[PDB]
Amino acid sequence: ATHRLLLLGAGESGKSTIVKQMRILHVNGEKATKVQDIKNNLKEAIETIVAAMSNLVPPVELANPENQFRVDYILSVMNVPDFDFPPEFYEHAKALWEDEGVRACYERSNEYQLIDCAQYFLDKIDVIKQDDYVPSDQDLLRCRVLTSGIFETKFQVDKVNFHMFDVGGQRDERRKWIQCFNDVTAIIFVVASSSYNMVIREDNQTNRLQEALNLFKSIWNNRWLRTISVILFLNKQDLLAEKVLAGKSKIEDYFPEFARYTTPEDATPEPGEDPRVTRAKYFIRDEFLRISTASGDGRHYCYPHFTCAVDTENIRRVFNDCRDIIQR
Amino acid sequence: DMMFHKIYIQKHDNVSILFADIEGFTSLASQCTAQELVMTLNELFARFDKLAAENHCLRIKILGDCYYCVSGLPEARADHAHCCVEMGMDMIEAISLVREMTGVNVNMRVGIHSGRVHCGVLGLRKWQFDVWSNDVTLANHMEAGGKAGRIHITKATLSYLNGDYEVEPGCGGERNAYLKEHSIETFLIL
Amino acid sequence: HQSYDCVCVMFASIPDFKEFYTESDVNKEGLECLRLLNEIIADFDDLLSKPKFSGVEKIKTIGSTYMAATGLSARQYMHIGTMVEFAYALVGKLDAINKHSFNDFKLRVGINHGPVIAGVIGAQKPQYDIWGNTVNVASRMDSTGVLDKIQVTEETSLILQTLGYTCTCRGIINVKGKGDLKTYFVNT
Numbered sequence: 271a272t273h274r275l276l277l278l279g280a281g282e283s284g285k286s287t288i289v290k291q292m293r294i295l296h297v298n299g300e301k302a303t304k305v306q307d308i309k310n311n312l313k314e315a316i317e318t319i320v321a322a323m324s325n326l327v328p329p330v331e332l333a334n335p336e337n338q339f340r341v342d343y344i345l346s347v348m349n350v351p352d353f354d355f356p357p358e359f360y361e362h363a364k365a366l367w368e369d370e371g372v373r374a375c376y377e378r379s380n381e382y383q384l385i386d387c388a389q390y391f392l393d394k395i396d397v398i399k400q401d402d403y404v405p406s407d408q409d410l411l412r413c414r415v416l417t418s419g420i421f422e423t424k425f426q427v428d429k430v431n432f433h434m435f436d437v438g439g440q441r442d443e444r445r446k447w448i449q450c451f452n453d454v455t456a457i458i459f460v461v462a463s464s465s466y467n468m469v470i471r472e473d474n475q476t477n478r479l480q481e482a483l484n485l486f487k488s489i490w491n492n493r494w495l496r497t498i499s500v501i502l503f504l505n506k507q508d509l510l511a512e513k514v515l516a517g518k519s520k521i522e523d524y525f526p527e528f529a530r531y532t533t534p535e536d537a538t539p540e541p542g543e544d545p546r547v548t549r550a551k552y553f554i555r556d557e558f559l560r561i562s563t564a565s566g567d568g569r570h571y572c573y574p575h576f577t578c579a580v581d582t583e584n585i586r587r588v589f590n591d592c593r594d595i596i597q598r
Numbered sequence: 599d600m601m602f603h604k605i606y607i608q609k610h611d612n613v614s615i616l617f618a619d620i621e622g623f624t625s626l627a628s629q630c631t632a633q634e635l636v637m638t639l640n641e642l643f644a645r646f647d648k649l650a651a652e653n654h655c656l657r658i659k660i661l662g663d664c665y666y667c668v669s670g671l672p673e674a675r676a677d678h679a680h681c682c683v684e685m686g687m688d689m690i691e692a693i694s695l696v697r698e699m700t701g702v703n704v705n706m707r708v709g710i711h712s713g714r715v716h717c718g719v720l721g722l723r724k725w726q727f728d729v730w731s732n733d734v735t736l737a738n739h740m741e742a743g744g745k746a747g748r749i750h751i752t753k754a755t756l757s758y759l760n761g762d763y764e765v766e767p768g769c770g771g772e773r774n775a776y777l778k779e780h781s782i783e784t785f786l787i788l
Numbered sequence: 789h790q791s792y793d794c795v796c797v798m799f800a801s802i803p804d805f806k807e808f809y810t811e812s813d814v815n816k817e818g819l820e821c822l823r824l825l826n827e828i829i830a831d832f833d834d835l836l837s838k839p840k841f842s843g844v845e846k847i848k849t850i851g852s853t854y855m856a857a858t859g860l861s862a863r864q865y866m867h868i869g870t871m872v873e874f875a876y877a878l879v880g881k882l883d884a885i886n887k888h889s890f891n892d893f894k895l896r897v898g899i900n901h902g903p904v905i906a907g908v909i910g911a912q913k914p915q916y917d918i919w920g921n922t923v924n925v926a927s928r929m930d931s932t933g934v935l936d937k938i939q940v941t942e943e944t945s946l947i948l949q950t951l952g953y954t955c956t957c958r959g960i961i962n963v964k965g966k967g968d969l970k971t972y973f974v975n976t
């Protein structure tokens with residue numbers, strides 16, 4: 271009746287977020303700490319966007335010469351330890367945030383390292399500053415904090431117990447995955463579908479998907495895990511779709527094969543979903559299917575599910591879609 | 599069993615761990631031919647191996663001039679601390695014969711902690727019973743941070759003792775790193 | 789039990805380990821690590837079976853330090869050469885573990901040769917383990933070596949040099965009982 275269920279993925283794949291929902295969904299209140307945490311993310315984002323406008327090629331000129339002093343303001347605060355968050359900050363954040371040349375630099379975000387609660391929280395500053403404010407669940411799900419360590423969540427669905435194991439999703443953090451490899455029922459590998467134009471932090475060279483592609487491989491072909499079948503969450507489906515539709519940067523450019531690609535017969539396209547979006551979300555699935563397929567020996571199998579983490583409505587659905595397969 | 603090799607290890611609790619070393623051993627080492635040395639060593643050690651049984655300690659291993667044993671293995675005991683004590687007790691007594699029987703000033707340096715362990719065997723070939731945990735390292739690091747022909751003991755090993763023993767501050771932190779650095783209160787025995 | 793002449797002693801430790809040893813509710817009080825030590829130490833003993841190492845004989849593992857010898861089966865010095873090819877082959881074994889443990893482990897070899905004894909100590913558990921100066925040194929070679937290289941003695945170095953091996957002098961090293969003396973690393 272008990273299911274030691276370990277949770278893997280690259281950096282910022284979306285793990286402690288799925289952890290998040292399982293708690294939202296299946297577990298029984300002074301979030302006042304998590305506010306401070308949100309606040310932090312705001313600084314973090316805006317500093318990071320201004321920062322690289324200069325650092326970029328081409329460089330990126332502020333829409334409004336006025337904002338230049340605000341720029342200056344920001345980086346005069348950038349490394350402060352215990353920050354106090356005075357009201358000017360938000361006036362100046364919003365300002366830069368309003369600046370079109372800033373928002374045009376946002377458009378080149380794939381070209382440097384930036385958290386994906388960016389737009390979302392920047393879009394809602396005024397709400398954040400009110401000292402009576404309490405974060406929506408949406409907001410609370412997006413507060414991003416480095417996972418240094420490993421954390422045991424435990425829950426129950428229809429009196430069936432779960433043991434969620436969260437790991438550090440970065441290079442130096444994977445040395446300690448092993449400790450979860452024995453006495454594991456099955457795996458959740460979480461992947462940031464949308465990060466096909468970006469490189470990872472660890473070196474700032476390796477393409478994030480490509481990284482996670484050949485992390486998958488290293489697990490699906492692992493010595494202590496030829497039994498254990500792996501549930502793949504193709505995470506971040508909203509963002510993905512967005513980029514595809516946005517059409518701005520082409521996929522085949524980042525993964526040259528997409529160009530020879532056509533669209534799968536078992537195609538189960540979301541209702542009203544775009545045929546070109548449908549192409550990529552699956553195509554990406556099939557880059558992982560070329561790994562799961564190419565070995566394992568009908569001795570374990572791959573469960574691919576398109577997912578958005580920050581979507582309890584999609585999450586419950588796919589977790590149901592999952593408690594299911596634990597039976598077998 | 600089909601993907602990890604089977605693991606011959608069992609967690610154990612409330613066990614006293616001992617380490618002991620030979621002060622100024624290399625003075626003896628330079629003295630005697632590799633042969634007639636081995637003898638005096640294999641001598642004392644089998645005697646140590648013996649008191650062990652008297653004192654209720656499963657011996658672990660010999661690592662050159664280093665000996666170590668434990669109390670609470672294989673099977674639990676309440677007196678567990680007292681045993682590893684009564685062991686050290688007999689060992690400096692024992693080694694004193696070998697001071698007379700040679701003439702060189704070779705002696706001992708005990709160190710004893712009490713905590714959790716692990717125990718069993720590793721790999722496939724040539725098994726030897728063994729123990730592992732910080733608590734263990736700690737005992738070892740107290741063989742390191744001991745003083746000659748005096749028995750060393752921790753915070754914990756006092757607590758499993760019920761002061762039937764007269765003792766005093768060793769303050770081992772001023773001998774060995776790991777002690778100091780981990781806030782360790784050490785004691786000697788009278 | 790009895791003495792000997794030309795026994796070659798090797799120690800190989802993995803010093804990256806003493807850190808990696810955690811204890812937590814999550815890692816069952818330090819056992820899940822002991823699990824990986826097992827998966828390695830084993831992977832190493834798997835090498836004894838090898839035909840070309842039929843001559844190699846493991847003695848004991850000390851914490852995560854491996855100990856094994858060529859010679860007790862009796863050009864004439866082939867057995868030292870042998871051993872070194874053993875050491876290297878654990879590194880093959882080890883880079884297999886890293887691969888799958890998402891980790892980085894280097895090996896720390898000390899090696900040597902000369903007068904040893906090879907008997908049984910204490911009646912209570914009678915165990916095969918070798919004494920002698922010769923040995924203590926192969927241990928100094930470990931404890932004072934370098935990750936990912938093999939550090940060997942002045943005597944040893946020559947012999948290995950007499951076998952299509954190349955070497956480099958690390959310099960001078962203290963031994964508590966044997967003063968200061970020249971040591972060497974093999975070149976890959």
Ligand SMILES: C=C[C@@]1(C)CC(=O)[C@]2(O)[C@@]3(C)[C@@H](O)CCC(C)(C)[C@@H]3[C@H](O)[C@H](OC(=O)CCCCN3CCN(C)CC3)[C@@]2(C)O1
Nearest residue numbers: 661664729730731732734735738805806809850851852853
């Ligand atoms: C492997 C896990 C871990 C952390 C657990 C543990 O308790 C140890 O196995 C002890 C303490 C423990 O098993 C008791 C024996 C011994 C052999 C002392 C071990 C080693 O020191 C290990 O470290 C090593 O493998 C390298 C250090 C060896 C240093 N020793 C010091 C004592 N002299 C006599 C020999 C060399 C050890 C610390 O490693």
Ligand SMILES: Nc1nc2c(ncn2[C@@H]2O[C@H](COP(=O)(O)OP(=O)(O)OP(O)(O)=S)[C@@H](O)[C@H]2O)c(=O)[nH]1
Nearest residue numbers: 280281282283284285286287412414439506578579
């Ligand atoms: N837009 C969008 N954002 C997501 C989605 N999933 C997660 N995020 C956001 O991106 C970040 C990634 O989630 P998080 O759990 O922190 O990554 P992670 O994989 O756990 O990071 P690590 O533990 O592997 S190092 C989070 O801050 C979360 O707000 C998604 O499906 N869509």
Ligand SMILES: Nc1ncnc2c1ncn2[C@@H]1O[C@H](CO[P@@](=O)(S)OP(=O)(O)OP(=O)(O)O)[C@@H](O)[C@H]1O
Nearest residue numbers: 620622623624661662663664918923924927928964
């Ligand atoms: N057969 C064996 N098995 C395991 N360890 C052994 C061994 N033979 C030697 N060693 C270890 O080899 C290491 C090096 O020994 P030093 O060169 S530091 O001599 P010292 O005796 O410590 O000198 P002191 O400080 O005056 O007592 C030691 O841990 C031995 O136990």
Ligand SMILES: [Ca+2]
Nearest residue numbers: 619662663664
């Ligand atoms: Ca010693």
Ligand SMILES: [Cl-]
Nearest residue numbers: 280283462482
């Ligand atoms: Cl990813």
Ligand SMILES: [Mg+2]
Nearest residue numbers: 285286287417
């Ligand atoms: Mg996380």
